[PDB]
Amino acid sequence: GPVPSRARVYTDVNTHRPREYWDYESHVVEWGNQDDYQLVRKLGRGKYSEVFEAINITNNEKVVVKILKPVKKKKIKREIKILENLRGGPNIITLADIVKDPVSRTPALVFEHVNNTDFKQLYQTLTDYDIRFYMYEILKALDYCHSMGIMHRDVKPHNVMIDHEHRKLRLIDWGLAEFYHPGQEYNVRVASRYFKGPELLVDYQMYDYSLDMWSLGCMLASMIFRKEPFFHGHDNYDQLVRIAKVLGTEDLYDYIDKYNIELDPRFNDILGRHSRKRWERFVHSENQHLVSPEALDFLDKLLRYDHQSRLTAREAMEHPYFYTVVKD
């Protein structure tokens, strides 16, 4: 059937790690004291959790409480194990506690609070300098988790929490994250539509860390071009069409041919024939101050159909685009 694929970096990180590192099913949760925390206000709801601002009454620190509710139960232990594995890594949200909520009777994850600037407001506002700075900060998080054998699989603006005042950034919501095992087939139903990689959209299951690099590319494109989202599909099929209208259909066919992937025949009537566009197409008087040759070359190396051809997180940090950024 399909041609197999392996990550070109950190391929065997988990194979050379003890069972207990990646065997999240066997992880035993360590419970804290739910009475330490007092819920203050509801911040949001997702498909698998309700999120509250709270106070840790033992130290008076503001905190965030994520009360879980998933239908697949092993997912709870997956997120917990991932968070524990990545704790203290650069720009990774810190899991501060795990408590049993008395009302839901489910695990509640307690994180450090981030005084956040809304991305709707914060994008279309960032300077060229600030875009490069924050991209480098996100890359620190991704190289860290990739190096630890973990793919995020839901990189998007909402999951990048920015305290713009202290110029602080954290990658959050590791509930879709998975351990990368070479040759493993994964669920293509991950990530949010506008940020789904071509691999997901063509049903290619043997994907890897490089999925997050496509998502990051979608974020970068939306920032430098001031078009939110950059690839604006009406559904998952139209999502691939929107991509092909930019990257072209010939490189798409080359990609699926390389892996002996067959497109859903549904595309016969909607995909059409599209040339690759030059990135200057998307530059105009209102975004030109955010665009540079370095920015375009960097973006070009992220937004590639072939997941194997994308810059890795580590390579991306090497890019000329980041030369202007002061290295702490």
Ligand X SMILES: Cc1c2c(c(C)c3c1[nH]c1ccc(O)cc13)C(=O)N=CC2
Question: Where on the chain is the footprint of ligand X (CB under 6 A)?
Answer: 43-44, 46, 51, 64, 66, 93, 111, 113-114, 161, 172-173
CA distance 204 to 189: 11
- Closest approach, Cβ 177 to ligand X, in A, equals 13
By C-beta, is 45 or 276 nearer to ligand X?
45
- The amino acid occupying position 190 is V
CA 177, 159, 234, 278 dihedral sign is: negative
Q: Counting Cβ atoms within 10 Å, is residue 3 exposed (0-12), middle (13-18) or buried (19+)? A: exposed
Please report the DSSP string for 248-261 in residue order: -HHHHHHHHHHTT-
User: Closest CB to ligand X belongs to which residue?
Assistant: 44
- Could you tell me the smallest distance in angstroms from the CB atom of residue 67 to ligand X? 10
The H or E element that residue 112 is part of is strand 107-112
Cβ 239 to ligand X shortest distance, Å: 22
Longest dimension (CA), the chain: 62
115 in Cβ contact with 163 (< 8 Å): yes
Q: From the candidates 143, 154, 173, 212, give the one annotated as an active-site residue.
A: 154
Task: State which residue, 13 or 176, has the beta carbon closest to ligand X.
Answer: 176
Is 69 one of the annotated binding-site residues? no
CA atoms within 13 A on the CB side of 221: 27
- Of 111 and 186, the one with the shorter C-beta distance to ligand X is 111
Nearer to ligand X, 33 or 115 (CB): 115
Answer yes or no: 203 catalytic: no
Q: Shortest Cβ distance from residue 97 to ligand X (Å)?
A: 13
Q: Which residues contact 132 (CB under 8 A, 6 or more apart)?
A: 321, 322, 324, 325
- Sequence ranges of the binding site for ATP: 66
Residues assigned a catalytic role: 154
- Sequence ranges of the binding site: 66
